Amino acid sequence: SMVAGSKYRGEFEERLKAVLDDIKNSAGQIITFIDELHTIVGAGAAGNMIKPMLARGELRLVGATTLDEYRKHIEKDAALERRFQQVYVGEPSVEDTIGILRGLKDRYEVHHGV
Amino acid sequence: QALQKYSTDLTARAREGKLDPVIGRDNEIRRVVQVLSRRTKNNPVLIGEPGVGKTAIVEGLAQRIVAGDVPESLRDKTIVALDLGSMVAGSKYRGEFEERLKAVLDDIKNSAGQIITFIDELHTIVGAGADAGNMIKPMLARGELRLVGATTLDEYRKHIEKDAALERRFQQVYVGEPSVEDTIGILRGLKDRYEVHHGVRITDSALVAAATLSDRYITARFLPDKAIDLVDEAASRLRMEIDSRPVEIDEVERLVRRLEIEEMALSKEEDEASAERLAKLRSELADQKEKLAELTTRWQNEKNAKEEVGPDDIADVVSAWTGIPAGRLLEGETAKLLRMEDELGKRVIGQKAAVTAVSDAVRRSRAGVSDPNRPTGAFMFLGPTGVGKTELAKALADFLFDDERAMVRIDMSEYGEKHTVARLIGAPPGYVGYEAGGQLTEAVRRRPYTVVLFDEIEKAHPDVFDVLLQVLDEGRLTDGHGRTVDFRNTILILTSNLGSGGSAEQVLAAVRATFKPEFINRLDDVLIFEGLNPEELVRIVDIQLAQLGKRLAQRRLQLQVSLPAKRWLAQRGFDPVYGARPLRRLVQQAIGDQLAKMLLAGQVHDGDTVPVNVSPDADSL
Amino acid sequence: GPTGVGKTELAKALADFLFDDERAMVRIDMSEYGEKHTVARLIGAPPGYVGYEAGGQLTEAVRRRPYTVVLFDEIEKAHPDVFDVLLQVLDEGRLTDGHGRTVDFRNTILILTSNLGSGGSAEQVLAAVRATFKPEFINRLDDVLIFEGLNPEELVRIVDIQLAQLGKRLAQRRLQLQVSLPAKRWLAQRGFDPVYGARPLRRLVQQAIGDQLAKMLLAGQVHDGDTVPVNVSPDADSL
Amino acid sequence: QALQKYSTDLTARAREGKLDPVIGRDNEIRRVVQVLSRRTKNNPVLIGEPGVGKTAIVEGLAQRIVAGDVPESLRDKTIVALDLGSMVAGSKYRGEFEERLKAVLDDIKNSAGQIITFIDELHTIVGAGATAMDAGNMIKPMLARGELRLVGATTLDEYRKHIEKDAALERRFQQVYVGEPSVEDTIGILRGLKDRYEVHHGVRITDSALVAAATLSDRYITARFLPDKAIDLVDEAASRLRMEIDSRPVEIDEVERLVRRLEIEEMALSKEEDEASAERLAKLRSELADQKEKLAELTTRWQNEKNAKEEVGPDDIADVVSAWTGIPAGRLLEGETAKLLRMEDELGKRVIGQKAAVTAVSDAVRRSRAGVSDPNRPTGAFMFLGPTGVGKTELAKALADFLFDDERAMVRIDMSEYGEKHTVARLIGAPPGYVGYEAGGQLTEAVRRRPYTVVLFDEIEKAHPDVFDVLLQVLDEGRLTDGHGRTVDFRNTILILTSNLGSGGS
């Protein structure tokens, strides 16, 4: 949504700077969450006015991506990779899955009529 | 209203009676509905081979919604047909495509789930970018937009399965191809739409044949698709004929016109050689005018005393296609098939036991009696040398195709080592010569009606036999690309030289020593050729002299042979160990050497006739 | 077992009532995998080579619709490295392909037909099997069945099957036959020899009925909507 | 009006009479029409070998539309010939190609089924504009509905390399197979095309010339296909004859330029202060004089011919066929019949004795230029054997000299290195997938170019008794096929096998 109608020469970077300054003005409350963050590599023709903010501890940037796109779009930019602490999420087992289904049953019961 | 700019309306088109009917396929439509009506991730993807009907399922679902045969959770919806090709049309500036796509997605979301988006061939969605077709996963994974798709079975694996985060959000629905008695029902349902476009009548007896024939002859394509084409082309041809005039009168007059045009340019030639080519063109033109007159006179009786596509126009179409003759012996071919061991006897003298067995397999294949899934004939004949076993294979291919260079001939003296099998089956993927296919395979796949001549088969390595083991008895051979090629209309012929004079079993107990029983069991008759008697050589002499005379006509030069010389040649055709090849060299030594010595020392010119006679020992011209 | 006995027929018959379509089984002919490098033909080529997107040939047909019947004809004619892939297909239930995916065979039914020995009474065939295959390969299979051979009594019913099939074939023109019991006995006794199985019977049916029928059929006089009887002469049988 | 930008027009050219005639092929045109006029999926595709005539069928259809020999469904249809190369001309931005294609398709659709498209060489449509797989299959919805008709034509192996790979798009086309015609059909084609060439080159073309072209180029030039390798001969013959009508004829134009060169060399050799070049100079002068003799002779004979060659004949075609693929196919034009009668005494200058073999080789060489020998068999296949030091390799080296004037022009292979079986792969090449595969065979590639040599198998008996089997086809006719699947013809060679069996018994 940030990249839209931004057809002029000084628009997308201006929008991103406005957003980043609005985040930094708040002291430490706002926590940005970028989903599928391997798409921040391009977006310019940019998307790279974030290395400073990451160096200065101002941004929070909790992110989530799949395994292969990580090494295919990020580990080729080891300047970035250092600023990221990885958490590994594994798939559950049958017992944990039964536990999850037991909690989610209520909403599918009410969406349908059964 | 950004949907109206980049989308058609399937439900609107269905309400105006612009879509074709959809017959059957209940399980697939029910699964599509019950996937399309769930809480999260409610978007199916129809997947299958090309031509089995996957756009037809979406169109049938649209018609079903219009009628009102859907559950209450899906009534009064509209099926919009999104079109990504016209959203990328003008998008030079760096936000136009993303903005258009966001506007369309927001238009879909601002509704109340009363819109079903239909992207056809959605393997074309992963690109479109230059971050595009990738800003759709948020809405996809929650069910905000209900996306019915359709791709083939290996554009999926090639483009979408590369993006495993995206293909998590699709629910594959497998669409398999129907059977023959399902295609018949589909054709019965669809008939009334072609009957009106081509103003003719289509017979149920033709609808059955269009599904039966196209299942055994046309193997590179899939069902209903390949059964509607026969009906369509038959109807179109019948309409062309219902217009100005029928066929095989159109050919005759169109040929007589060209013959006359060429005769009216061959008369004004000041040549002595071109004077005899004008004497045959005239004769042929007269013979064609006679046939034209007969057919035109019979057309009048037919018109005074062929208005719907019967089960024979389908066969005519499937025979123009694929070249295979599947007709009913239209009174001009049966007269020729009844005289076959007399047309083969003009080139191969003797060997009636083998001529009366090759021609016996073509009759019971044109008459529709032979097994429909096995080659039309697979038999090995063997005998001594110079007897006529490679000549019968070239004299049979000469009257089925009228050109003896129209047969697939491979010489098995070059298959000495076992790794030469790759020459006729191709190379597996990953190796040097791969995007070229086989050599025997890629030749029987373009014209599946030739005859195949494996020559000198026992000179090969005893593994090419194992490769041939399935071509016989099943008619199928698979190459490196994974294509099955059907040898079900070919006539396989295997010549050999084992025994080489053994009477009956010394030549038969030598086969059983080199070939295995599982190989000798796939064959038809194993025909043993015989030596040449002195009485069946005085006719080979006549054949050789006729060939020589036909070879000399290019020079306007004849020669008259007297019976004493014509039987001197036969008496010096001898040594029943080398067959009839010594006679070919004898004719050269006796006639041709001195003929060509005279022919370039003056003494003989064009138009001359050179009588040959028997000097007390040699021949003199 | 021996030749012409019914071991390739039982696969096409088993796959005909599970899927109701005889062409619904994955069939590969193992007489074409005679070299080492032809293993890449049924597993696919590694990524980045000439034939890459085409994928494997045994793999790509089971990865989708993984409930089929797989047939390996003449398994002994292959190279003793193709057996080293069926090795992991057995006893684990899945193999990997050129990409790296692991398609699973835990629902298929593998069938392997052979002709080893072919003259051994009952033990030479097992000796040839043990000499040609590895013990850790023979160990994983189920019963190594052995077909027996057709008897003069197990052949009259095959005659009946073949005649019914012929009638079904030439019923597209309303041309049913009418066979007599002496005719069937003649056809069953004439072609029997217990070394070539049941293909001599097919060839005899052709040469005895089909030749005369096709000679009479395209010379008029046997027009459609007709039933010709077949009866026995001293030696041949006449229509 | 986008069509006007990215397309030519074929019916207009057929109306202005700029298209060549189209003779025969009624079955193919009728099938093209009846596939072009069906309800859905009306897209034919002509397919075949390169040269048999596929674009000719489409131009014939256009002329037939202009004339009026089409059924009611195809009257006034205005065939259009698309051009995808000019549509990708400048499209470096994100949607410039997509919008052009959309404009063209909408323009074709706005007509009520009048325009008939024609994309020649339609295998170039698969990856039309790429970056992902988006373009070239935007026509895929309109193809199935039958809204654009799209006649197209590709070869037979550029079709399975580019289209059969994409079985979703290969479904929308119907294949029409075009096989090459016979000689009696090529003659009828030539008889109708023999006016445009007669007009372009201001000459006249005899009918025997057409017959001779159609006959000779079917047995001598075996790399190409028929309707075209017969027109090439007539075209080159006519162009040569027109070049000669410019006052000077041939064989005076060469002798003049030769005498000029000899004079320039002799004028520069005179100022050589040596003694070794005083003997070379006294020979170039003799050559110059002996050439001036025949130059003046030809110059005078031309005057007789001119005072006391305006059409192409059946021997100018043979002259072309001899100039290309240097097999001599002429008619023994009196300058070599004397040599061919003297052959035995001319070979007896280098080999002494062995009259029975010299005569047996000379007869086979002689009765091949007189048109008596079998046209499909090698011109001779001899095996002569005897004791050692006798002359059986000297004779083979003298025949090559007599025929080509260079002993190094024959293809000699030494059969004493073919001791083991696997050495056969040396003269036939390796199958697909193995190490030396692009190189092909050695005998095969040596005879495939210059198919008029002498082949010599020295010491045939010292090889393995399985190399003799690969010769059973080369001896009975001229065919031997290499690993690539292409057959070469040995019908113009002389095969010779020397050996030493039974050294000196009897």
Ligand SMILES: Nc1ncnc2c1ncn2[C@@H]1O[C@H](COP(=O)(O)OP(=O)(O)OP(O)(O)=S)[C@@H](O)[C@H]1O
């Ligand atoms: N169940 C069916 N009922 C009626 N017509 C059908 C049915 N299935 C297929 N057809 C027709 O057969 C042809 C098949 O065309 P489609 O179904 O559009 O092919 P497809 O399924 O879209 O495959 P691709 O990959 O898109 S070419 C069309 O003419 C359909 O109208």
Ligand SMILES: Nc1ncnc2c1ncn2[C@@H]1O[C@H](COP(=O)(O)OP(=O)(O)OP(O)(O)=S)[C@@H](O)[C@H]1O
């Ligand atoms: N019965 C025959 N009738 C006519 N010509 C024959 C006959 N037998 C042999 N010939 C001639 O023999 C020559 C070649 O005969 P082929 O049949 O090719 O020899 P073959 O039968 O192949 O034996 P091999 O083992 O292959 S050398 C041709 O010129 C034929 O015309």
Ligand SMILES: Nc1ncnc2c1ncn2[C@@H]1O[C@H](COP(=O)(O)OP(=O)(O)OP(O)(O)=S)[C@@H](O)[C@H]1O
């Ligand atoms: N028990 C049987 N019942 C009916 N037909 C049979 C029987 N056994 C063989 N046949 C016939 O034999 C033919 C096929 O035999 P197959 O079993 O395929 O040969 P096979 O058993 O594979 O032996 P090989 O090694 O392949 S030669 C068909 O015509 C079948 O009808």
Ligand SMILES: Nc1ncnc2c1ncn2[C@@H]1O[C@H](COP(=O)(O)OP(=O)(O)OP(O)(O)=S)[C@@H](O)[C@H]1O
């Ligand atoms: N039936 C015919 N009537 C008249 N001229 C013909 C006929 N068939 C072919 N020709 C001529 O023979 C030549 C064949 O050229 P084309 O048919 O254009 O080649 P092509 O078939 O397109 O092969 P490619 O692969 O496309 S270059 C042309 O000079 C045609 O004019």
Ligand SMILES: Nc1ncnc2c1ncn2[C@@H]1O[C@H](COP(=O)(O)OP(=O)(O)OP(O)(O)=S)[C@@H](O)[C@H]1O
């Ligand atoms: N008839 C001959 N006339 C002239 N020189 C001859 C004659 N026979 C032999 N020679 C000479 O002998 C030399 C060698 O003879 P070759 O013919 O090359 O041997 P060969 O005939 O090949 O016998 P083998 O079995 O190959 S050693 C030639 O180079 C000639 O110089």
